[PDB]
Write a protein that binds this ligand. Structure first.
Ligand SMILES: *[C@@H]1O[C@H](CO)[C@@H](O)[C@H](O)[C@H]1NC(C)=O
Lengths: 34, 42
C-alpha cells in the first residue's frame, strides 16, 4: 500500500492517490479562470 | 549566442511577436509547457 503501482500513468502508490484527491487546488495555472 | 523563451504562449501567434525579429526564422522552434522556446535544438 506504499510501494509504486505500475498500473497508473503516474507511478503513485495508493495512499499518495488518496492524498492527491483530498486537496483541491484553486487557480493552478497551465499553458492556456484567470 | 542566445535563445529566447516566450513564456505562456502557444507559439502560433508569436511569429508576429509585436522590435528585433532575427530569431523567428528558426527552423528549430520548440514547444514546452512553460511556453515556446526559439533558438535551441532538442
Ligand atoms: C496550440 O494551438 C493549436 C492550434 O492553434 C492547437 O491545435 C493546440 O492544441 C494548442 N496547444 C495546446 C497545448 O492545446
Amino acid at each position: 500500500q506504499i510501494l509504486p503501482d505500475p498500473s497508473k500513468p503516474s507511478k503513485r502508490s495508493f495512499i499518495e492517490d488518496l492524498l492527491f484527491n483530498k486537496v483541491t487546488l484553486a487557480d493552478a495555472g497551465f499553458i492556456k479562470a484567470q | 549566442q542566445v535563445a529566447v523563451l516566450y513564456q505562456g504562449v502557444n507559439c502560433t501567434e508569436v511569429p508576429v511577436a509585436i522590435t528585433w525579429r532575427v530569431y523567428s526564422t528558426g527552423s528549430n522552434v520548440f514547444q514546452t509547457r512553460a511556453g515556446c522556446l526559439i533558438g535551441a535544438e532538442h
